[PDB]
C-alpha cells in the first residue's frame, strides 16, 4: 500500500489572512471572469465565464429554467444526462433558442449551455447534443480515473477534433488529473476519497506543473464540499477556476423540483443522482437565483479585496492561507 | 518505559484514493480468494478461502448452522471452545458430516470448519477436535503474546507436526507477531492496546520483513474493529489476508442466538465471551447470511476496482491510503 | 497561494506552567501598569495605563459613564464613533470636564479618554475630538491592513505631528503590523482570519523585531477572544501590552444599554457594531464595574506570582507557555 | 515567553501495548511495594508501601478511620491539616495508638500515618505532629514551586535533620522537581498548568537525571487525574512510584463524610479543600475500602502481567506506551 503523511483537510479548517487593501479595491471593481476550457500559453480561453459558478449535473438542479437564469448572470448549467437522449437534447435546444447584464452568450447572442454525458451511450448521445446546440459537455462520474473516460474523450476527438469541448473526471489527486489531461479533457472536475481542500490543493499543484511542462493550461472545477460563501472564496484562492454546486441552486425558484410547504416552511425537493429516484430530502426555498447569487458574489468580492485582489488570478497568487486548529472549530 | 511517536489510528481515519480503473475491472471479475495458513515461497497455501470473511470464536455467533452457511459462501467458522470438549467436537462432527457455489469444501467434498481452543485443556481438547474432523484450530485469547501460546503450539507440533493447522494470538505489534511466528503459528490474529488500523499496518510490515527473511508467508487476520463494509476493504488493502467478525454475523438467521421482538423491531441476542453468560445486548436482525454477505462483498469488489485491483494481492500493492483529519470526521 | 504549516490556536489551547515564586510576590505587590502609546529606547511612554484593560469602541459598551468608571480604576475607554461627530465630541467633553485610587488622570487632573474614528470623516471628526479634549484616538476597523489607515494616520501627522496619538488597525500577522508601524500608528490592535493566540504571538514577534531594528517600541492590543480571566493573563504573557474587551464591560451598571429582567434574570442589552442596530442579544448583569474588575485583576496578579512575575514585562519574559491537547479540552 | 512544542496529554490518550507474559506471571505473584521516601544508591527506602495508593490530604477523605483502613491494606493516609493543630495531632495519635495482611506498620507494630502541613504554622504544627507520632509529613499546596516550600523544609532539616520525613510540592515540570529536590524534599508530588501524563513523564525524566547525577533516588507521586484503574497502571508505568487519590477514597464507608440517600441512590459528601466549606458535591457510595482497593489492584496486577512485569520497577522499564488519536477517543 502507499501511505500519505499529512491527513486531508476540509474547507472548514482554513482561513484567509488579510493582505494589503488599496483604495482602488472595492467590490464594484472586482472582476470574476474565469476560463472554462483549456488553452495554451499566449491565448485566451475560447469560453470564459463571467462568474465562477456552474450548476451541478443533476435532475433536481440543472433544467432549462435554471440554465437560462444562470446564463443570464454569467454562469453556465450542465443539463442532466440522467434522462433520455431525446429529452436532454430538447432541453439543450430550448435554452439555445429561448430568445424569440453579465449574460453568458454566444456569437448569435444565444445563452450558453452545457450537457452531462456518460461513458456508455456517448456514441448516440454526443451527436444529438452537438446538433441541439450544446456549447460544452461534461462526463458525469464520481470516479473519473478510468479507461472509460479516456475512451469517451478519444471518440469525441476522433469524430470532432477540438471542435467539441468535453469536461471530465472527478479525480482527487495529481495522478488522476494527469491521466485525464493527457486523455484530452478541456477542463477537469475535482471532488470525491479525499477532503475537498487537500484534493484541490494537490490537483492545482499538478495542473501548474503540467502548464509549465506543456504550455497548456487546463481549468479545474471544485465540485461540492462548499457549505458557505467563504468556502467559495477559499476554493478559488486555492487554485480552482470555477465551482460546481448542487444543493445551493436547488433552493431557487428556477430549479426543476417542487416547492413543498411543510408546516410553515416552504421547501424544495432535492434528491441525489444515485437515489432510488443517494438521498431524497428538502432544501429551504430561497427565492429567485439572481438575488441569491448576487448576495453570495458580493461577499466574495469583499473578501477578495481584504486579500488585495481585483481578479481571481490575483487572488490565487496573493492569498495567504492558514490552517485552523481542531479546537478552534 | 518505551514511547511511540505517532498515535494509533482507527479505520475511520482512513480513505482509499482511487487508482486507474481498466475496462476489464468489473465486480464480477474480482477474485476474493485468500490463503488461510502459512506456506513458503513458490507454493500455494494448503487452504485458501473463497471470501476473506471468517466468523468469530463466540457462543453468540459460531455454531453449526453458522459454520455450514458460511462455508457454503466460501468462508469458514471457528466453532466456539467455550463449551465442553464433547459438545464442541460434536458440533465439528455435525458440520463435517452434514452432507448426507463458492463452497469451501475438502477432498471428500465436506464443508470446512475451524475450532477455537484454549491454552489449558489443549491436551484433551485438541485430539478430540482432530478426531472429530476439525480442519483448522485457533487459540482463542485477547493477548496471545505469552509463553502459554508457545507451549500449546509446541505440544501440537510435537504430537502432530505440520499436519494440524493452528492459528494463534491476538497481538498488536511486530514483536508479538514475530514471537508467534517463531513459535510455529500457521496464521496470526491481530487486534486488541492499539488502534486497529495501526496494529494491522505494523504487524503486516513485520510479516513482510519475516517473509523476506525466511521465505515463509504467514497470513494475518484482522479481528474486530470493522464498523462498515468500507472498513473491510481498508483492512485488506492495509495487508490483512482475511477478517474475523462477531457482531456482523450475530445478526443473521444462522447465528445460534434467539430472535427477540422488541416493540416492532426484531433483534437477536449477542453477548461477549467475557460476559457473565463482557456485554449482553442485541443486534438488529438482518435475515439470512447469504444475502447480506453478498451485499457486502459486492461493495468491496467495486471499491477494489476503483483502486484498479482484481485480486486482494493487487489491492495490497496498488492501494493509495490517506489519513483523514479529525475535523473531517 | 501562500500556505502556513502550523494551524492557529485559540487561548483555550494554552496553559502557563508555574515558575519560582519568591516570598515577596504577593498580589498586593504586583504592578499592572502598561504603556499605551509608542516611545523610543531610553524613554517612557507619554501615557501609561494603571491596569491593562480598555473598553471596546462600541455603542453598547463605551459611553461617558463607562469612560469615567474605567478611568477611575486605571483603564481607558474609547467612546464609540458610530454616532454623529457632535455627539461623540460632546461625550468626550463630558468625561474631560466631569470633575466639577488608580485613577488615570492628566496634567489638569482630568480623567483620560479615547475616541474611535473611521477612515472617512476623519477630516471633520478628528479636529472636533481634539478640540473636545480626546487624549487618544483609535481607527475602528476589523481589517486595518489597508491604504485607508495609512492615509488617515498620514493626514493626522501632517496636521498635528506627534501631538495627536492615533491607534490603528486590527491586523493578525507581522506583515500587517509592519505596515501600520511604518504608517505611524502609536499602538496597534490585533484580532480578526486567525486564532487569537497565534495572531498575538506572531505580531508580538514582529513588534520585537521592529523594536530591535528601529529602537521604537509600539504597544500592541489584543482585541477580543478573551473568554475568561485566565485568558487575560495569557494574552499579556504572550506579549500584548493591554487588552480590549466588549462583552466583559457591557454587563456592568455603567454600560450605556438597558437592563432587562427576563423571567428572574436581570440582563443587559448587547449588540455588535455591524448589527442592524452583527448580533443583538443580552449579557448577564454583573453590577458595578469596580467590583468586577477588582475580582478579575486579583486573579491575574495571583497567576502572575505563580509565574514569579511582579510586573507585566517580567511576566512576558518569564512565562512558560505550553499547548494543550485537543482531547485535554 | 518560553514556548513548548508538543502539547501536553492526559492519561486517556495513552495505551499500554502488551509485552511477553511468562508462565510465572500471575496476579498472585505480582509485588506492589514501592518506596515512599528518598534513599541513596545501594540502600532501600526507610519506608516502603505495600500498595502504591495513598489518600489525599483532604477533609472529605483523610480522617482517622480512613488512615487505619488504608494502612491495614498496605497504603498510607495523610491526615488533613485544614483543621486546628490540636485536632490534627489528636487524629495522628488516635491512629498510632489504635491497637489496644499487608498492614503498613512500624517497629512497635503500630499503623503508619502521614499528616499534611502548610507553609505558615509549621513552627507550631510540625513539633505537635512529630510528638503525636506522625510517620511522614507532606506540604499541602497546589503550586509548590516557591520559596515558601524551601523555607519550611529548611526549618525542619535544621530542627530535626533527616529524622523527620517531609514530602513536598505539586510541581509539573523538571525545573520544579529539581528545585524541591535540592531543597531537601523526601518525595515530590506531581500535578497541577499541565496535562497529568506529560507532567509525570517530564518530572520522572528529571528525577532519573537527578539520580544519575547525585546517586539519590527521590520517589514521585502522581496526585490526581486518575479516572479509571487503567490510569493507575499507566501512572506507575510512566515512572510514578505511588499515586494520591481523593474522590476514589471519598466513596468508601471509612471516609469522614456523611452518607446521603438521594432518591434511591446512596451517596457520600465530597468537597474540595478550596471550597467554601472548590466544589461540594457527592460521590457514589462504594462500601468498605478493602473490597474496592482489592478489585482495583487485582486489575493492575493483571495488566502488569500483560506487560510482563512482576514488580513496579520492572513495569517501568518494560512498559511500551503509545499515544492514541483524538478520534480514537
Amino acid at each position: 500500500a502507499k501511505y500519505y503523511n499529512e491527513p486531508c483537510h476540509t474547507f472548514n479548517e482554513y482561513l484567509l489572512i488579510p493582505g494589503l487593501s488599496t483604495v482602488d479595491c472595492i467590490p464594484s471593481n472586482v472582476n470574476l471572469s474565469t476560463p472554462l476550457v483549456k488553452f495554451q500559453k499566449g491565448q485566451q480561453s475560447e469560453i470564459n465565464l463571467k462568474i465562477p459558478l456552474v450548476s451541478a449535473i443533476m435532475q433536481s438542479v440543472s433544467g432549462e429554467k435554471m440554465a437560462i437564469a444562470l446564463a443570464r448572470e454569467g454562469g453556465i448549467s450542465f443539463i442532466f444526462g440522467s434522462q433520455s437522449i431525446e429529452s436532454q437534447a430538447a432541453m439543450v435546444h430550448a435554452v439555445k433558442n429561448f430568445k424569440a447584464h453579465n449574460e453568458l452568450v454566444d456569437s448569435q447572442k444565444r445563452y450558453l449551455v452545457g450537457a452531462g454525458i456518460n461513458t456508455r451511450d456517448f456514441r448516440e448521445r454526443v451527436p444529438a447534443l452537438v446538433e441541439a446546440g450544446a456549447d460544452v459537455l461534461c462526463i458525469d462520474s464520481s470516479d473519473g480515473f478510468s479507461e472509460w473516460q479516456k475512451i469517451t474523450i478519444g471518440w469525441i476527438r476522433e469524430k470532432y477534433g477540438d471542435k467539441v469541448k468535453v469536461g471530465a473526471g472527478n479525480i482527487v489527486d495529481g495522478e488522476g488529473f494527469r491521466y485525464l489531461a493527457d486523455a484530452g479533457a478541456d477542463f477537469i472536475k475535482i471532488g470525491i476519497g479525499r477532503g475537498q481542500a487537500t484534493a484541490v490543493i494537490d490537483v492545482v499543484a499538478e495542473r501548474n506543473k503540467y502548464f509549465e511542462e506543456t504550455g497548456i493550461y487546463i481549468p479545474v472545477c471544485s465540485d461540492g464540499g462548499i457549505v458557505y460563501d467563504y468556502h467559495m472564496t477559499l476554493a478559488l484562492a486555492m487554485g480552482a477556476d470555477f465551482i460546481m454546486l448542487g444543493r445551493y441552486f436547488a433552493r431557487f425558484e428556477e430549479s426543476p423540483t417542487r416547492k413543498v410547504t411543510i408546516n410553515g416552511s416552504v421547501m424544495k425537493e432535492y434528491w441525489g443522482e444515485g437515489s432510488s429516484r443517494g438521498v431524497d430530502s428538502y432544501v429551504p426555498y430561497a427565492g429567485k437565483l439572481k438575488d441569491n447569487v448576487e448576495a453570495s458574489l458580493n461577499k466574495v468580492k469583499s473578501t477578495m479585496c481584504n486579500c488585495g485582489a481585483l481578479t481571481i488570478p490575483q487572488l490565487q497568487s496573493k492569498a495567504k492561507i492558514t490552517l485552523v486548529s481542531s479546537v478552534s472549530i
Side-chain angles (χ1 to χ4, degrees), chain A:
Chain A
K2 184 276 206 74
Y3 296 98
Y4 300 75
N5 294 140
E6 241 252 315
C8 35
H9 309 279
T10 57
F11 287 131
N12 282 92
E13 309 175 54
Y14 288 95
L15 262 172
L16 288 154
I17 298 177
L20 173 65
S21 305
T22 45
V23 293
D24 57 281
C25 205
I26 48 178
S28 37
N29 290 0
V30 178
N31 178 47
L32 258 25
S33 315
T34 14
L36 180 75
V37 296
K38 73 173 179 181
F39 57 91
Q40 48 198 212
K41 225 189 78 171
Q43 302 200 65
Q44 280 278 272
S45 183
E46 279 159 87
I47 306 170
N48 291 273
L49 303 176
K50 272 89 172 297
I51 61 170
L53 306 179
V54 305
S55 62
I57 315 170
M58 297 171 64
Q59 296 181 347
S60 28
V61 25
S62 293
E64 61 171 85
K65 291 314 157 194
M66 178 63 67
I68 290 155
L70 186 46
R72 287 185 168 138
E73 298 305 312
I76 203 177
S77 298
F78 284 89
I79 274 53
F80 58 99
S82 44
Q83 58 184 328
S84 76
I85 302 176
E86 300 77 53
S87 308
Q88 192 188 19
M91 284 180 46
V92 171
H93 181 86
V95 182
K96 296 306 295 175
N97 289 98
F98 182 77
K99 290 179 165 184
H101 226 297
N102 291 65
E103 66 167 12
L104 193 53
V105 122
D106 67 22
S107 39
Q108 279 79 83
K109 301 283 168 51
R110 316 206 295 305
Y111 291 134
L112 253 59
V113 273
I117 64 169
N118 58 70
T119 56
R120 303 182 293 90
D121 59 24
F122 61 89
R123 256 177 285 264
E124 311 292 305
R125 184 170 234 117
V126 171
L129 270 25
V130 176
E131 282 184 75
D135 300 278
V136 207
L137 305 181
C138 188
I139 304 176
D140 184 19
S141 183
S142 53
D143 184 356
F145 196 174
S146 68
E147 281 203 76
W148 296 109
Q149 300 243 339
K150 180 166 176 303
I151 290 173
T152 305
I153 298 170
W155 181 88
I156 296 173
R157 291 282 173 256
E158 175 183 61
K159 216 283 183 66
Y160 304 94
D162 268 275
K163 193 208 82 59
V164 171
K165 306 307 182 182
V166 203
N170 255 265
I171 48 86
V172 285
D173 71 336
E175 196 182 295
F177 164 86
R178 183 65 78 139
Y179 183 77
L180 295 180
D182 289 345
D186 293 288
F187 75 81
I188 296 177
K189 270 201 300 150
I190 309 168
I192 311 180
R194 209 188 217 185
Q196 195 58 203
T198 302
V200 174
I201 294 172
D202 283 41
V203 172
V204 162
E206 192 65 25
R207 186 275 300 287
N208 290 347
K209 177 191 283 64
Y210 195 86
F211 175 67
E212 285 168 40
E213 301 178 353
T214 63
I216 292 174
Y217 181 90
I218 301 176
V220 295
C221 173
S222 177
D223 182 15
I226 267 57
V227 182
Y228 298 122
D229 299 350
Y230 189 75
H231 290 356
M232 281 184 201
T233 313
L234 277 176
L236 299 171
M238 286 167 187
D241 300 275
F242 54 100
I243 307 162
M244 177 169 276
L245 305 164
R247 276 175 283 269
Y248 178 88
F249 293 109
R251 300 172 300 156
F252 307 148
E253 183 55 47
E254 299 86 350
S255 69
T257 67
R258 290 158 45 221
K259 255 186 294 183
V260 174
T261 309
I262 299 163
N263 54 258
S265 305
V266 175
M267 314 288 276
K268 292 223 60 176
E269 302 189 291
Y270 176 86
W271 61 90
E273 287 297 288
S275 75
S276 313
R277 185 178 178 180
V279 308
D280 191 339
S281 194
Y282 300 98
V283 297
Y285 172 67
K288 308 235 72 187
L289 177 154
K290 167 172 168 285
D291 304 306
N292 286 272
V293 168
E294 173 190 285
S296 294
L297 297 187
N298 274 344
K299 189 180 301 173
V300 174
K301 289 173 174 175
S302 302
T303 305
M304 284 179 80
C305 278
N306 281 128
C307 296
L310 279 309
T311 62
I312 294 169
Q314 276 192 333
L315 174 65
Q316 296 174 337
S317 69
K318 287 164 138 283
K320 296 191 292 180
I321 310 163
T322 188
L323 199 48
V324 154
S325 72
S326 37
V327 172
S328 302
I329 302 168

